Coordinates of C-alpha atoms in Angstrom, one line a residue:
Chain F
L1 CA 10.0 15.2 0.1
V2 CA 12.3 12.8 -1.4
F3 CA 9.2 11.8 -4.1
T4 CA 8.5 15.7 -4.9
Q5 CA 11.9 16.0 -5.7
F6 CA 11.1 12.9 -8.7
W7 CA 11.7 16.2 -11.9
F8 CA 14.9 15.4 -12.3
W9 CA 14.9 11.3 -11.8
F10 CA 11.1 9.4 -12.1
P11 CA 12.1 6.6 -9.4
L12 CA 12.1 8.5 -6.4
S13 CA 8.5 8.6 -7.1
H14 CA 8.2 5.2 -5.1
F15 CA 9.0 7.2 -2.4
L16 CA 5.1 7.8 -0.9
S17 CA 5.3 3.8 0.1
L18 CA 7.4 6.1 3.3
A19 CA 4.4 8.6 3.7
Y20 CA 1.8 5.6 3.3
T21 CA -0.2 5.4 6.5
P22 CA -1.7 2.6 7.3
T23 CA -5.4 4.4 8.2
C24 CA -6.3 1.3 10.5
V25 CA -7.1 0.9 13.9
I26 CA -6.5 -2.1 15.4
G27 CA -8.0 -3.7 18.9
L28 CA -5.0 -5.9 19.8
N29 CA -5.5 -8.0 23.4
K30 CA -3.1 -9.8 26.0
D31 CA -2.6 -12.9 23.6
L32 CA -1.0 -10.3 20.9
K33 CA -3.6 -11.4 18.1
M34 CA -7.3 -9.9 17.3
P35 CA -9.8 -10.4 19.2
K36 CA -14.0 -11.1 16.6
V37 CA -15.0 -7.9 17.9
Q38 CA -16.0 -5.5 15.5
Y39 CA -16.5 -1.4 16.2
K40 CA -18.9 0.6 15.5
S41 CA -19.5 4.2 14.1
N42 CA -22.6 6.7 15.2
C43 CA -22.6 8.1 11.7
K44 CA -24.5 7.8 8.8
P45 CA -22.7 4.4 6.6
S46 CA -22.6 6.7 3.3
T47 CA -20.3 9.7 4.0
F48 CA -17.3 6.8 5.1
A49 CA -18.3 4.3 2.9
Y50 CA -15.8 3.1 -0.2
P51 CA -16.3 4.8 -3.3
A52 CA -18.5 2.9 -5.6
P53 CA -16.7 0.9 -8.3
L54 CA -16.7 2.2 -11.2
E55 CA -34.3 2.3 5.1
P56 CA -33.6 5.1 3.2
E57 CA -30.3 5.3 5.0
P58 CA -29.2 5.1 8.8
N59 CA -26.5 6.6 10.8
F60 CA -25.2 3.8 12.0
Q61 CA -22.2 1.2 10.8
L62 CA -20.2 -1.6 12.2
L63 CA -16.3 -2.8 11.6
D64 CA -13.8 -5.4 12.6
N65 CA -11.2 -5.5 14.4
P66 CA -9.2 -4.7 10.8
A67 CA -10.4 -1.5 10.9
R68 CA -10.3 1.2 7.8
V69 CA -11.1 4.2 10.2
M70 CA -10.6 8.1 8.8
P71 CA -9.4 10.8 10.6
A72 CA -12.5 12.7 10.6
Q73 CA -14.3 8.9 10.7
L74 CA -12.5 8.2 13.7
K75 CA -13.7 10.5 16.8
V76 CA -17.0 9.8 16.3
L77 CA -15.9 5.7 16.5
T78 CA -16.6 4.0 19.1
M79 CA -17.1 0.5 20.5
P80 CA -20.7 -1.0 21.1
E81 CA -22.4 -0.7 24.5
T82 CA -21.1 -4.2 25.7
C83 CA -18.1 -6.8 24.5
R84 CA -15.9 -8.4 25.7
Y85 CA -13.3 -6.4 25.0
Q86 CA -13.2 -2.7 25.8
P87 CA -10.7 0.2 24.7
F88 CA -7.7 0.0 27.5
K89 CA -7.0 3.1 25.3
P90 CA -10.0 6.3 24.6
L91 CA -11.1 5.1 20.9
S92 CA -11.4 8.6 19.6
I93 CA -7.4 9.0 20.0
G94 CA -7.3 6.4 17.2
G95 CA -4.6 4.1 15.4
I96 CA -3.6 0.5 17.6
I97 CA -5.6 0.1 20.6
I98 CA -5.7 -2.5 23.2
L99 CA -8.1 -4.2 24.8
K100 CA -8.5 -4.9 28.4
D101 CA -10.8 -8.3 28.7
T102 CA -13.6 -9.2 30.4
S103 CA -13.9 -12.8 32.4
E104 CA -13.1 -14.6 28.9
Chain E
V1 CA 64.1 9.2 -31.5
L2 CA 61.6 11.6 -30.9
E3 CA 63.9 14.7 -30.2
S4 CA 62.6 18.6 -29.0
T5 CA 66.5 20.2 -29.1
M6 CA 67.3 23.8 -27.8
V7 CA 70.6 25.4 -28.7
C8 CA 72.2 28.0 -26.9
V9 CA 74.8 29.3 -28.4
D10 CA 77.6 32.5 -27.0
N11 CA 77.7 35.2 -29.1
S12 CA 80.4 37.1 -25.9
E13 CA 82.7 39.7 -27.1
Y14 CA 85.7 37.3 -27.1
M15 CA 83.2 35.3 -29.9
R16 CA 85.2 38.1 -31.9
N17 CA 88.1 35.6 -31.9
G18 CA 89.5 33.8 -34.3
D19 CA 91.0 31.1 -32.8
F20 CA 89.4 28.5 -35.0
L21 CA 89.9 29.5 -38.5
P22 CA 88.2 31.0 -40.4
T23 CA 86.6 32.9 -37.2
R24 CA 84.7 32.2 -34.3
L25 CA 81.4 33.0 -35.3
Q26 CA 82.2 31.5 -38.7
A27 CA 82.6 28.2 -36.5
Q28 CA 79.4 28.7 -34.7
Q29 CA 78.1 29.2 -38.1
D30 CA 79.4 26.3 -39.0
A31 CA 78.7 24.0 -35.9
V32 CA 75.3 25.3 -36.0
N33 CA 74.6 24.0 -39.6
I34 CA 76.2 20.6 -39.1
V35 CA 74.2 20.0 -36.3
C36 CA 70.8 21.2 -37.8
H37 CA 72.1 18.4 -41.1
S38 CA 72.2 15.9 -38.2
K39 CA 69.0 15.9 -36.4
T40 CA 66.8 16.2 -39.9
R41 CA 69.0 13.6 -40.7
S42 CA 67.9 12.0 -37.8
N43 CA 63.6 11.3 -37.2
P44 CA 62.1 14.0 -39.7
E45 CA 59.5 15.3 -36.8
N46 CA 62.1 16.4 -34.4
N47 CA 62.1 19.6 -33.6
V48 CA 64.4 22.7 -33.2
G49 CA 65.7 26.1 -31.5
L50 CA 67.2 28.4 -31.0
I51 CA 68.9 31.1 -28.0
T52 CA 71.8 33.2 -28.1
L53 CA 74.0 33.6 -24.9
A54 CA 74.4 37.7 -24.0
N55 CA 74.2 40.0 -21.5
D56 CA 70.4 40.0 -21.8
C57 CA 70.5 36.0 -23.2
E58 CA 67.6 36.3 -26.0
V59 CA 66.3 33.8 -27.4
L60 CA 66.1 33.3 -31.6
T61 CA 63.5 30.4 -32.3
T62 CA 61.3 28.7 -30.6
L63 CA 60.5 25.2 -31.2
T64 CA 60.8 24.0 -34.9
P65 CA 62.0 21.0 -37.0
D66 CA 62.9 23.3 -39.7
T67 CA 66.3 24.4 -40.1
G68 CA 66.5 27.1 -43.1
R69 CA 65.1 29.6 -40.1
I70 CA 67.5 28.3 -38.4
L71 CA 70.5 29.6 -40.4
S72 CA 69.5 32.1 -41.6
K73 CA 68.4 34.1 -38.0
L74 CA 71.7 32.7 -36.6
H75 CA 73.3 34.7 -39.6
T76 CA 71.9 38.1 -38.6
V77 CA 74.6 38.1 -36.0
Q78 CA 77.6 40.2 -34.4
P79 CA 79.7 38.7 -31.1
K80 CA 78.8 41.2 -28.0
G81 CA 78.7 41.5 -24.1
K82 CA 79.5 38.2 -22.1
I83 CA 78.4 35.0 -21.6
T84 CA 74.7 35.7 -18.8
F85 CA 74.8 31.9 -19.1
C86 CA 72.6 30.4 -16.1
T87 CA 69.0 32.5 -17.2
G88 CA 70.3 31.4 -20.2
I89 CA 70.2 27.6 -19.7
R90 CA 66.8 28.5 -17.4
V91 CA 65.1 30.1 -20.0
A92 CA 66.0 26.8 -22.5
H93 CA 64.9 24.5 -20.0
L94 CA 61.9 26.6 -20.3
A95 CA 61.8 26.1 -23.4
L96 CA 61.9 22.8 -23.9
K97 CA 59.0 22.5 -21.1
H98 CA 56.7 25.0 -23.5
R99 CA 57.2 22.1 -26.5
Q100 CA 54.1 21.1 -28.6
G101 CA 55.6 17.3 -28.5
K102 CA 55.4 16.2 -25.2
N103 CA 57.3 13.0 -26.3
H104 CA 59.6 13.9 -27.7
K105 CA 63.1 13.7 -25.5
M106 CA 64.1 17.4 -23.9
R107 CA 67.8 18.1 -25.5
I108 CA 69.6 21.4 -24.8
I109 CA 73.4 22.3 -26.6
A110 CA 75.4 24.7 -25.1
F111 CA 78.2 26.2 -27.3
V112 CA 79.9 27.5 -24.6
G113 CA 83.8 28.9 -25.8
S114 CA 84.2 31.4 -23.7
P115 CA 85.4 31.7 -19.5
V116 CA 82.5 31.1 -17.3
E117 CA 82.3 33.0 -14.5
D118 CA 80.1 31.2 -12.5
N119 CA 79.7 30.0 -8.9
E120 CA 79.6 26.3 -8.8
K121 CA 77.3 25.8 -6.4
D122 CA 74.2 27.7 -7.5
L123 CA 76.3 24.7 -11.2
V124 CA 75.3 21.9 -9.5
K125 CA 71.7 22.7 -8.1
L126 CA 70.5 23.4 -11.7
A127 CA 72.5 20.3 -12.9
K128 CA 69.6 19.4 -9.9
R129 CA 67.2 20.3 -10.9
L130 CA 67.5 20.0 -15.2
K131 CA 68.5 16.0 -14.0
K132 CA 64.8 16.5 -12.3
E133 CA 63.6 18.0 -14.6
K134 CA 64.5 15.4 -16.8
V135 CA 66.5 17.0 -19.9
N136 CA 69.7 16.0 -21.2
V137 CA 72.6 18.5 -22.0
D138 CA 75.3 18.8 -24.3
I139 CA 78.0 21.4 -23.7
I140 CA 80.3 22.3 -26.7
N141 CA 83.2 24.6 -25.7
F142 CA 86.1 26.3 -27.0
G143 CA 88.7 29.3 -26.6
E144 CA 89.1 28.3 -22.4
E145 CA 90.3 25.0 -21.7
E146 CA 91.1 25.9 -18.4
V147 CA 88.8 28.5 -16.8
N148 CA 85.7 26.7 -16.6
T149 CA 85.9 23.0 -18.5
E150 CA 86.5 22.0 -14.9
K151 CA 83.6 23.5 -14.2
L152 CA 81.9 22.2 -16.8
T153 CA 82.8 19.0 -16.2
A154 CA 81.7 18.8 -12.5
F155 CA 79.0 20.0 -14.1
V156 CA 78.3 17.1 -16.2
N157 CA 78.9 15.1 -13.8
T158 CA 76.4 16.4 -11.6
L159 CA 74.3 15.7 -14.4
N160 CA 74.8 12.5 -15.1
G161 CA 75.1 11.7 -10.7
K162 CA 76.1 7.6 -11.7
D163 CA 74.4 6.6 -15.1
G164 CA 72.8 10.1 -16.5
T165 CA 75.0 9.2 -19.5
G166 CA 73.4 11.2 -21.5
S167 CA 75.1 15.0 -20.3
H168 CA 77.8 15.5 -23.1
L169 CA 81.3 17.5 -22.8
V170 CA 83.0 18.7 -25.9
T171 CA 85.9 20.2 -25.3
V172 CA 88.0 21.4 -28.3
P173 CA 91.5 22.7 -28.6
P174 CA 92.3 26.0 -30.5
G175 CA 92.7 24.2 -34.0
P176 CA 91.1 24.7 -37.2
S177 CA 86.8 25.0 -38.0
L178 CA 84.6 23.4 -35.2
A179 CA 83.5 21.2 -37.8
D180 CA 86.0 17.8 -37.7
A181 CA 85.0 17.1 -33.6
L182 CA 82.0 17.5 -34.1
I183 CA 81.1 14.9 -36.6
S184 CA 83.5 12.4 -34.8
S185 CA 82.5 13.8 -31.5
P186 CA 80.0 11.3 -29.0
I187 CA 76.9 13.3 -29.0
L188 CA 76.4 12.7 -32.7
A189 CA 78.9 9.3 -32.9
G190 CA 75.9 7.8 -30.5
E191 CA 73.6 9.4 -33.4
Chain Z
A1 CA 19.0 5.3 -26.1
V2 CA 20.2 8.9 -25.5
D3 CA 18.2 10.4 -22.6
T4 CA 16.0 13.6 -22.8
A5 CA 17.7 15.4 -19.9
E6 CA 20.4 15.6 -21.7
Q7 CA 21.9 19.5 -21.1
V8 CA 24.6 21.5 -23.1
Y9 CA 26.7 23.6 -20.6
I10 CA 27.8 26.7 -22.8
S11 CA 30.8 28.5 -21.9
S12 CA 30.2 32.2 -21.5
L13 CA 33.0 32.7 -23.6
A14 CA 31.2 30.7 -26.2
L15 CA 28.2 32.5 -26.1
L16 CA 29.9 35.1 -26.5
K17 CA 32.1 34.7 -29.4
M18 CA 29.2 32.3 -31.2
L19 CA 26.8 35.3 -31.2
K20 CA 29.7 38.2 -31.9
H21 CA 30.2 36.0 -35.3
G22 CA 26.9 35.8 -36.6
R23 CA 26.1 39.5 -36.0
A24 CA 29.7 39.6 -37.8
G25 CA 28.2 38.2 -40.4
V26 CA 24.6 38.9 -41.3
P27 CA 23.4 37.5 -43.3
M28 CA 25.6 35.3 -44.4
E29 CA 24.3 31.7 -42.4
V30 CA 27.6 32.3 -40.9
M31 CA 29.4 29.2 -39.4
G32 CA 32.0 28.2 -36.6
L33 CA 33.5 25.1 -35.0
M34 CA 33.7 24.3 -31.6
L35 CA 35.1 22.4 -28.7
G36 CA 34.2 21.0 -25.7
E37 CA 33.5 17.5 -24.0
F38 CA 31.3 14.7 -23.2
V39 CA 31.4 14.3 -19.7
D40 CA 29.0 12.0 -19.0
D41 CA 25.8 10.7 -21.4
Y42 CA 23.4 13.4 -19.5
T43 CA 26.1 16.6 -20.0
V44 CA 28.1 18.1 -22.8
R45 CA 30.3 21.1 -22.2
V46 CA 31.0 23.3 -24.7
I47 CA 34.0 25.6 -23.7
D48 CA 35.3 27.6 -26.5
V49 CA 33.8 28.9 -30.6
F50 CA 36.0 30.0 -33.4
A51 CA 34.8 30.6 -36.6
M52 CA 35.4 29.4 -40.4
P53 CA 37.3 32.5 -42.2
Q54 CA 34.8 31.1 -45.7
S55 CA 32.9 33.4 -47.1
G56 CA 30.8 32.1 -49.5
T57 CA 27.4 32.9 -51.5
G58 CA 24.3 35.4 -49.7
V59 CA 21.8 32.0 -49.2
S60 CA 24.8 29.1 -48.3
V61 CA 28.2 29.2 -46.8
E62 CA 30.7 26.7 -47.9
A63 CA 34.1 25.0 -45.9
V64 CA 37.8 26.7 -47.6
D65 CA 40.3 25.9 -45.2
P66 CA 40.6 21.5 -43.8
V67 CA 44.3 22.9 -42.9
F68 CA 42.7 25.7 -41.1
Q69 CA 41.2 23.9 -38.5
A70 CA 43.4 21.2 -38.4
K71 CA 46.5 23.4 -37.4
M72 CA 44.0 25.7 -35.2
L73 CA 42.8 22.6 -34.0
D74 CA 46.5 21.5 -32.8
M75 CA 47.7 24.7 -31.7
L76 CA 45.5 25.2 -29.5
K77 CA 45.6 22.1 -28.1
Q78 CA 49.4 23.3 -27.3
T79 CA 47.8 26.1 -25.3
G80 CA 44.7 27.6 -25.0
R81 CA 42.2 24.5 -24.8
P82 CA 42.9 21.0 -24.9
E83 CA 39.5 19.8 -26.2
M84 CA 38.6 18.9 -29.3
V85 CA 35.3 19.0 -31.3
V86 CA 32.2 18.1 -30.0
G87 CA 29.3 20.2 -32.7
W88 CA 29.5 22.8 -34.8
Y89 CA 26.9 26.0 -35.0
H90 CA 26.1 28.6 -37.3
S91 CA 23.5 31.2 -37.5
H92 CA 19.9 32.0 -39.1
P93 CA 19.6 35.7 -38.9
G94 CA 15.8 35.2 -38.7
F95 CA 14.7 31.9 -39.3
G96 CA 14.0 30.6 -35.5
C97 CA 16.3 28.0 -34.5
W98 CA 15.2 25.4 -37.2
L99 CA 17.7 23.3 -39.8
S100 CA 17.8 23.5 -43.7
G101 CA 18.7 19.9 -45.9
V102 CA 22.1 20.5 -45.6
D103 CA 23.0 21.2 -42.2
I104 CA 20.9 18.2 -41.4
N105 CA 23.7 16.4 -44.2
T106 CA 26.4 18.2 -42.3
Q107 CA 24.9 17.1 -38.7
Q108 CA 25.1 13.5 -40.4
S109 CA 28.1 13.6 -41.2
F110 CA 29.1 15.1 -38.0
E111 CA 27.0 12.2 -35.6
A112 CA 28.8 9.8 -38.3
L113 CA 32.3 11.1 -36.8
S114 CA 31.1 10.8 -33.1
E115 CA 27.7 9.4 -33.0
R116 CA 26.8 12.6 -30.2
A117 CA 27.6 15.5 -32.6
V118 CA 25.6 18.4 -31.6
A119 CA 24.6 21.2 -34.0
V120 CA 24.1 24.8 -32.4
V121 CA 21.7 27.7 -34.2
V122 CA 21.8 30.9 -33.2
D123 CA 19.4 34.1 -33.9
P124 CA 21.5 37.4 -34.0
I125 CA 18.6 38.9 -35.4
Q126 CA 16.4 37.7 -33.1
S127 CA 18.6 37.6 -30.0
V128 CA 17.4 40.8 -28.4
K129 CA 18.9 43.2 -25.3
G130 CA 17.9 40.9 -22.7
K131 CA 17.1 36.9 -23.7
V132 CA 18.6 35.5 -26.8
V133 CA 17.8 33.2 -29.8
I134 CA 19.9 30.5 -29.7
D135 CA 19.0 26.0 -29.6
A136 CA 20.6 23.2 -29.5
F137 CA 20.6 20.1 -32.1
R138 CA 20.8 16.5 -33.1
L139 CA 19.8 14.7 -36.1
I140 CA 16.4 12.0 -35.6
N141 CA 17.2 9.0 -36.8
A142 CA 14.9 7.3 -40.0
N143 CA 15.8 4.3 -38.8
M144 CA 14.2 4.7 -35.6
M145 CA 11.4 7.3 -37.0
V146 CA 10.6 4.3 -39.3
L147 CA 11.0 1.2 -36.6
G148 CA 8.6 3.0 -34.4
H149 CA 11.4 3.5 -31.6
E150 CA 11.7 7.3 -29.8
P151 CA 13.9 9.8 -30.1
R152 CA 14.2 9.6 -26.4
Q153 CA 13.5 8.6 -23.4
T154 CA 12.0 11.6 -20.8
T155 CA 13.1 10.2 -17.3
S156 CA 12.7 14.2 -16.3
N157 CA 9.5 16.4 -16.7
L158 CA 12.4 18.7 -18.5
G159 CA 10.8 17.8 -21.3
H160 CA 8.6 20.7 -21.6
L161 CA 11.4 22.6 -23.4
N162 CA 9.7 25.7 -23.4
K163 CA 7.5 24.7 -26.0
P164 CA 9.3 23.6 -29.3
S165 CA 8.1 26.3 -31.3
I166 CA 5.9 26.7 -34.4
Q167 CA 8.1 27.8 -36.7
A168 CA 11.1 25.0 -35.4
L169 CA 8.2 22.5 -35.9
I170 CA 7.1 23.6 -39.7
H171 CA 11.0 23.4 -40.4
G172 CA 10.8 20.0 -39.1
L173 CA 11.2 20.1 -35.2
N174 CA 11.3 16.6 -33.2
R175 CA 9.9 14.9 -37.0
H176 CA 14.1 15.5 -37.7
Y177 CA 15.6 17.1 -35.7
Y178 CA 15.0 17.2 -31.8
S179 CA 16.2 20.6 -29.5
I180 CA 18.1 19.9 -26.3
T181 CA 18.4 22.5 -23.0
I182 CA 20.9 25.0 -23.0
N183 CA 22.7 26.6 -19.9
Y184 CA 25.7 28.4 -18.2
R185 CA 27.5 27.7 -15.7
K186 CA 30.4 29.4 -14.3
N187 CA 33.4 28.6 -11.6
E188 CA 32.5 32.1 -10.3
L189 CA 35.7 33.7 -12.1
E190 CA 33.9 35.0 -15.0
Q191 CA 31.0 35.5 -12.4
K192 CA 31.8 38.4 -10.2
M193 CA 33.6 39.3 -13.2
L194 CA 30.4 39.8 -15.6
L195 CA 29.3 41.2 -11.9
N196 CA 32.2 43.9 -13.0
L197 CA 31.7 44.5 -16.3
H198 CA 28.6 47.0 -15.4
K199 CA 30.1 49.0 -12.1
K200 CA 32.0 52.1 -13.0
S201 CA 34.7 54.1 -11.3
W202 CA 34.8 56.3 -8.3
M203 CA 35.7 59.3 -11.1
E204 CA 32.2 59.5 -11.6
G205 CA 31.4 57.9 -8.1
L206 CA 32.3 61.0 -7.2
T207 CA 32.1 63.6 -9.7
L208 CA 29.3 66.2 -9.3
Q209 CA 27.7 66.5 -12.4
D210 CA 28.5 70.2 -13.6
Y211 CA 26.3 72.7 -11.8
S212 CA 25.9 75.5 -14.9
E213 CA 24.1 72.8 -17.3
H214 CA 21.9 71.6 -14.1
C215 CA 20.1 74.3 -13.5
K216 CA 19.3 75.3 -16.7
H217 CA 18.4 71.6 -16.8
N218 CA 15.8 72.2 -13.8
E219 CA 15.0 75.7 -15.7
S220 CA 13.9 73.6 -19.2
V221 CA 12.1 71.0 -16.5
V222 CA 10.0 72.9 -15.0
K223 CA 9.1 74.6 -18.4
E224 CA 7.8 71.5 -19.9
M225 CA 6.4 70.7 -16.4
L226 CA 3.9 73.9 -16.5
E227 CA 2.9 73.0 -19.8
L228 CA 2.3 69.4 -19.1
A229 CA 0.0 71.1 -16.0
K230 CA -2.0 73.5 -17.9
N231 CA -3.4 70.1 -20.5
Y232 CA -3.5 67.8 -17.6
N233 CA -5.8 70.7 -16.1
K234 CA -8.1 70.6 -19.1
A235 CA -8.1 66.6 -19.0
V236 CA -9.3 66.9 -15.6
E237 CA -12.0 70.1 -16.3
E238 CA -13.5 66.7 -18.0
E239 CA -11.4 63.6 -16.8
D240 CA -14.8 60.6 -15.7
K241 CA -16.6 64.1 -16.1
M242 CA -19.1 64.5 -19.8
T243 CA -18.7 60.0 -19.1
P244 CA -15.5 58.9 -21.5
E245 CA -15.3 55.5 -19.7
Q246 CA -17.1 54.1 -23.5
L247 CA -13.9 56.9 -25.2
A248 CA -11.4 55.3 -22.5
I249 CA -8.0 55.1 -23.5
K250 CA -8.7 55.9 -27.0
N251 CA -10.4 59.7 -26.0
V252 CA -7.3 60.4 -27.7
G253 CA -3.9 58.2 -28.8
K254 CA -1.8 61.0 -27.7
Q255 CA -0.2 63.1 -24.8
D256 CA -1.3 61.9 -21.7
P257 CA -1.1 64.7 -19.1
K258 CA -0.7 62.2 -16.3
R259 CA 1.8 59.7 -17.4
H260 CA 4.7 62.7 -18.9
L261 CA 4.2 64.9 -15.5
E262 CA 4.4 61.8 -13.4
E263 CA 7.6 60.6 -15.4
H264 CA 9.2 64.6 -15.7
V265 CA 8.9 64.1 -12.0
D266 CA 10.7 61.4 -11.1
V267 CA 13.6 62.1 -13.2
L268 CA 14.0 65.4 -11.5
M269 CA 14.0 63.7 -7.8
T270 CA 16.5 61.8 -8.8
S271 CA 18.5 64.7 -10.7
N272 CA 18.2 67.2 -8.5
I273 CA 18.5 64.9 -5.4
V274 CA 21.2 62.8 -6.1
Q275 CA 23.4 65.9 -6.9
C276 CA 22.4 67.4 -3.5
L277 CA 23.4 64.5 -1.6
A278 CA 26.8 64.6 -3.3
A279 CA 27.2 68.3 -3.1
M280 CA 27.1 67.4 1.1
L281 CA 28.7 64.6 1.0
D282 CA 31.7 65.9 -1.0
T283 CA 31.9 69.3 1.3
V284 CA 32.5 67.0 4.3
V285 CA 34.2 64.5 3.5
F286 CA 36.8 66.2 1.9
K287 CA 37.7 67.5 5.0

């Protein structure tokens, strides 16, 4: 709202920093740190890749705990078959997930 | 000093009198002339205005530094009716209020030779109002040296409070024109 | 440095006086002064405008009585508006809202006196029974133009200014003088007053229109309706038939049946219905 209220004062347009919502999913462990584990999207890494800076195509993509996961490109996102860390919360939920860990 | 001076003048049927040579109305004319000349010799920007006190306490000239219009208008006057006072003083105070030059100190002078038919309590309350409104009054009485002199003394004492020297009384006994008293009067002696 | 969002709120009183003066002064480029105030760095409040007795020549005007103006100033300080000069205005009857050379010189003087003065222009010829052709102005510094500086920082979208007029551009807009945005603010009294201006009296509010005149009015309206019906029947007799689509509106440049029919039927609705209602209401309300 404040940003939209810039007609009358430009300096207000900075307020969109507030609305900036990190489009990320973080897998956090009990040690309160990133575990070096990867995520997988069962989808083409062509429909959800970064825009081009200014195998025909697979249906799989991989990522790390710091994971740019768009809304539509979140439901299909999944943890690989097996890992030390498993999603204590359904990954299709999104956001920050805690990871239950195996033996070690 | 920057002075805005309102002047009220009685014209009651008693001012048909002639105890003062040549006659009371002409004595008033002389008094207004001398006072106007004194004010002019004072700071020229000083402003003047005129009121006549009668059954309806009319107003002749609003504030102006001129004296020619003052005297000219005052000439075209005849004594009639009885002084209504009170209302005249209030009108004069409103006049002083609505003065263009606010810096000018606010001074009323009343030619009140007559018997005053006023309640002294309301006189005192009006004194309070005027002193709180910061206007200094000078009375010139002639004739009723006994009927109203005590009332005017009480009124002036009220205005003065303990230090309000700006208030002044000048009561003149029977005698010649009302010129020598005014010229050798404290109100103009201070000038 | 001045701002783009600078506004001039002109009192309704000021606008009315400006317009009346100019309309009186057509064609003379009549001139008047206004008292307002500089509330802040983004606003200028214009209170009142009073004219100038001068009546010069059919191409130019001139100040006559600086004594006149000084006395007006002192007295209005005494009573009226204790404001004090903020600009000046003059009509340009049928030119737009641009400043002539003499206009610009007068301004230059005004700014020299008070850097943030204002000029104002009105077109009583053009100001319509509706929107009103007016504008405000302030010069452009040649020093700034040569140094490459710019008139105003536009810290707003209030820089559209409603498409600066081509005529103003031609006459020098934005190259020596720049437009400013006018506005009208009312402290509710003049507002509801304005509302009152048009409002009419219950005298008429209940005064039923005479009825003989009304009967004759209906007679005439029904007659013209009959004739319009005749020509409408003729028009529909072909209408689309014989395909005037190519003819379109240009089938005839005169006497459309339908439009007249609907207009008069609507007006006679209004008349007859409201008069009958007033009759009912009076008959029953005065008992």
